[PDB]
Structure formats: C-alpha cells, structure tokens
Paper text:
The enzyme, [name] (PDH), from the filamentous fungus [name] (CcPDH) of the Basidiomycete division, is composed of a catalytic [name]-dependent domain classified as a member of the novel auxiliary activity family 12 (AA12), an AA8 cytochrome b domain, and a family 1 carbohydrate-binding module (CBM1), as defined by the Carbohydrate-Active Enzymes (CAZy) database. In the catalytic cycle of CcPDH, electrons are transferred from the reduced [name] in the AA12 domain to heme b in the AA8 domain, which acts as a built-in mediator and transfers electrons to a heterogeneous electron acceptor. Therefore, CcPDH is thought to be involved in the extracellular oxidative degradation of the plant cell wall. Here, we present the crystal structures of the AA12 domain in its apo- and holo-forms and the AA8 domain of this enzyme.
The complex of the AA12 domain with the [name] crystal diffracted to a 1.3-Å resolution, and the final model was refined to R and Rfree values of 15.9% and 17.7%, respectively. The asymmetric unit of the holo-AA12 domain crystal is composed of two AA12 domains, each of which has a [name] and a calcium ion, 11 ethylene glycol molecules, 2 acetate ions, and 1,520 water molecules in the asymmetric unit. The AA12 domain exhibits a six-blade β-propeller fold that is also present in other known [name]-dependent glucose dehydrogenases in bacteria. The [name] molecule was bound by the AA12 domain at the bottom of the active site, which is a small cavity near the pseudosymmetry axis of the propeller fold. The C-2 and C-9 carboxyl groups of the [name] formed ion-pair interactions with Arg273 and Arg621, respectively. The C-7 carboxyl groups of [name] interact through hydrogen bonds with His539 and the amide groups of Trp563 and Asn564 on the main chain. The ortho-quinone O-4 was connected by a hydrogen bond to Asn431, and the side chains of His363 and the O-5 atom were bonded to Arg430 and the calcium ion. The catalytic calcium ion was also ligated to the N-6 nitrogen and the C-7 carboxyl group of the [name]. The calcium ion is a seven-coordinate pentagonal bipyramid with axial ligands to the side chain carboxylate of Asp451 and a water molecule. The ethylene glycol molecules bound at the active site of the AA12 domain apparently mimic the hydroxyl groups of the bound glucose in sGDH, suggesting that CcPDH shares the mechanism for binding and, consequently, the means of oxidizing pyranose with those of sGDH.
Numbering used by the authors: 241 to 649
C-alpha cells in the first residue's frame, strides 16, 4: 500500500512509526472533527459548519464516495453510532439529538431532541459516547465556561463534567443536561473532549488542562505554564453505576514537571493548587480529588482516544497541539502501553508517577516545535480517531487542515 486512488497529496510532511503506513483518504473538508465507523464499516465525519458526511470505503479502507448525511451548520464535534447500527447521536454546543439511521444508504431521518441547554462560548464541544456494554446509555461532556470556572465546584453547575443518560427513559422532547436524567459520572473535569470505553465497559476520559498556570511562592507569582500542568486520563468506571468521581478542577491540577515546585518536593501525578492557601490547598486535593491514571505532556491538547483491538493492548491518543506553549508541542498521534484484566479492564503499564516517558509517537509532523500556525509553519492537527473492526486501519481527522488520514498496519 502506498496511497488511495484519487486522494489528494498530504498537505504537510507526515512521519509514521516503524511498521505502519499513512495516507490521506479525504481532503478539502470543512473542519472535520469527530469521526466514527458505522456497522457496515462506512466512515462518518462531523464537518463543523457543514454537517455529518458519509463515506463509502474500499477493501483497503480508502474512500470511494462521499455524501451529506445530515445537512446542519450547528453540529460541531460529537458523533456516535448505536451498537444496533440503526441510530446515531450528534451534538451542537447546546443540544444532543438522535436520528434513525440506515447504513445501507447512510441516511439519517426522524431527528429527536435528547439533551438541551448545554451551550457556553468557551468550551463548546459536546462529545457523545454511546455505551457499548450498556447500549441504552450515553455519555455527554460539557467543558468549563472559562479557563478557571469557579462555579464548577458544584455538580449542579452543569459544566466541567460528564453525565450519563438513559435513552429509553427520556421524554420525547428531551431533557436539560442538569436534570435527574443526567447522572454525573465525573465532575471537576475541565474539558474532557476524548471519551472511550474499555472491554469491561469502563468509561475512560482524557482532559485538556489549565492554561497559563502559575504557582504562588512566598507571595510571588511563578509562571509555570511551559511545562505544567499535565494532560491526563481518568478511569470513570461503570456508567451504569455513576458515582460522580471528582477530578479536581477548578482547584486541583496535576504535576507534570516537578522542578517547578521548589517550596516542597513533588512527583509527576501529584496534586498542586496555584495559591496553596485557604480551604483548597495541595493537602486538600490529596484528601478529596481522584487521581488520573496516566499523564501526557502539557498543552498537547488531546481530543480523542481509542483502544487498540484484539492483541493490541495500547491506547491511542490524538494530540491537537498547543497554543499556550513556546515552543509548541503535540500535533501528533501517540501510543500508551497497557494491559487488560481477565474481565477486560484496561490499565496503563507505567505507574502514574513514571508515565511522563511511557507514551511514544505514532504519527507526527516534521517537528512539533515548528508548528506556530503563522506563515509557512503549518501542521496537521489531530482531532478524531477510529479503528476499523479488523484492527488494521486507524483513521485520523485533522480539522484545521481539512483532512482525514488512514494509518495502516
Ligand atoms: O493548552 C493549550 O495550548 C491548548 C490548546 C488547545 C488547542 O489549540 O487545541 C486546546 C486547549 N489548550 C484546551 O485547554 C482545550 O480545552 C481545548 C479544546 C480544544 C478543541 O479543539 O476542542 N482545543 C483545546
Ligand atoms: Ca490547555
């Protein structure tokens, strides 16, 4: 395999790990965000500002034709296909809807309003994940309204949190996100755009953390943003038994670089607060917040993740790349090694405190540190991931470059 028939050349230099090949399958798309595959293996793409587009595939996984499945200017990221293959769910910043779906023709009909009132202008993606273990259940993310959204201390803020809804219980015209139907799976989660599940049905989420981090040291503001805080994954567990896991936000953040913490020694994965005073101190975080399972580098901006299939026991993560770091970093797909229990529960191989070095590059730009976005510096910016059912092809969207790629074993 070298390339897909009729597909455009990649816009940018793309390097891949040993044993893989990469090629574009789609170009010139309008802000392609979330992607998935239906039950007949067709590719579905949210083209933010256009709608859901549907793409038939050949035996190599190349795209042969495209059509508009949902003509809608408001759906802006989230998309999933029910395990039955006969329903899809997609969202704007404000509302999640379902449609009846027929994979034979990639046709969406009979729109139904599910969940309402979610809009904010700061973090406006509403990631959708339908539980594969419990197919009547679906999760929705609502990120914070602001870098440090203090009201998110309360669950009933309806922000920086993921709720699980039972489709079969929803009134016909839908429900507010903050309602008894939206059961809090995790809160204190700044912006958890990437959501997936392991083979046991546990929900794992991945977080975009704090911008412009500082640490108060003897009353002076130390700028620690270059290498703090960590991006991170949470294991939110069984979505049929939601328990409102507290992830720490808006007060507690996760150490990436310990050398930024001179007042008292820290390890990667430890909690810190910006001020370390009043009620919400470092010690308070230790006693009250649930730790993530693994770390990824500051500002890398994970937007999706997917587990490998079959005998591939890795987690794959799309890192959109930073704006709040000099030099920039991310702009890649990475691999995190792990293992499964007998029941299919995934865990990373590295202990949390050793996880800074545990990931590795799968798909990269020429040099992530060269990706400023001014002049000729431009890079592909991974957003969405999906594996083919045979585990041989991994699709990757890049919103700002208008591309979808296939990574082939
Ligand atoms: O720290 C950063 O440099 C940085 C970069 C990006 C990015 O440009 O994608 C995001 C974030 N942070 C972030 O915190 C966040 O919630 C976020 C959401 C998105 C998105 O594309 O949906 N990008 C980013
Ligand atoms: Ca950030």
């Amino acid at each position: 395999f070298v390339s897909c028939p009729g597909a455009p050349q990649p816009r940018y230099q793309m390097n891949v790990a040993n044993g893989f090949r990469v090629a574009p399958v789609l170009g010139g798309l309008t802000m392609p965000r979330g992607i998935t595959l239906d039950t007949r293996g067709n590719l579905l793409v949210v083209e933010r500002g256009r709608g859901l587009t549907g793409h038939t595939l050949d035996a190599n996984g190349c795209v042969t034709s495209s059509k508009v499945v949902i003509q809608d200017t408001q759906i802006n990221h989230g998309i999933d296909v029910h395990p039955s293959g006969r329903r899809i769910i997609a969202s704007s910043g404000d509302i999640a809807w379902s449609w009846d779906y027929d994979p034979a023709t990639m046709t969406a009909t009979n729109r139904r309003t599910l969940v309402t009132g979610m809009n904010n202008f700061y973090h406006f993606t509403r990631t959708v994940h339908i539980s594969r273990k419990y197919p009547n259940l679906f999760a929705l993310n609502v990120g914070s309204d602001g870098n440090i959204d203090v009201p998110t201390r309360q669950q009933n803020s309806g922000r920086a949190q993921i709720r699980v809804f039972d489709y079969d219980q929803l009134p016909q015209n839908g429900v507010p996100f903050v309602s008894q139907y939206g059961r809090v799976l995790g809160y204190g989660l700044r912006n958890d755009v990437g959501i997936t599940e392991d083979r046991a049905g546990n929900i794992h989420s991945i977080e975009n953390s704090l911008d412009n981090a500082y640490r108060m040291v003897n009353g002076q503001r130390r700028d620690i943003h270059t290498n703090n805080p960590a991006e991170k994954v949470y294991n939110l567990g069984d979505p049929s038994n939601p328990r409102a896991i507290f992830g720490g936000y808006p007060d507690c953040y996760t150490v990436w670089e310990p050398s930024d913490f001179t007042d008292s020694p820290k390890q990667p994965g430890d909690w810190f607060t910006q001020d370390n005073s009043g009620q919400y101190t470092d010690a308070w975080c230790n006693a009250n917040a649930v730790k993530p399972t693994l770390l990824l580098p500051p500002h890398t901006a994970p937007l999706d993740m997917k587990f490998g299939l079959g005998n591939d026991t890795n987690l794959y993560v799309a890192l959109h790349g930073s704006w709040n770091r000099q030099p920039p970093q991310g702009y890649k797909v990475v691999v995190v090694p792990g293992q499964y229990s007998a029941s299919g529960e995934w865990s990373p191989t590295a202990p949390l405190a050793q996880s800074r070095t545990a990931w590795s590059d799968l798909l990269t730009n020429r040099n992530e540190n060269q990706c400023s976005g001014f002049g000729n510096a431009n890079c592909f910016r991974p957003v969405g991931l999906v594996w083919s059912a045979d585990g041989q092809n991994l699709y990757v969207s890049s919103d700002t470059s208008g591309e979808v790629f296939i990574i082939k074993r």
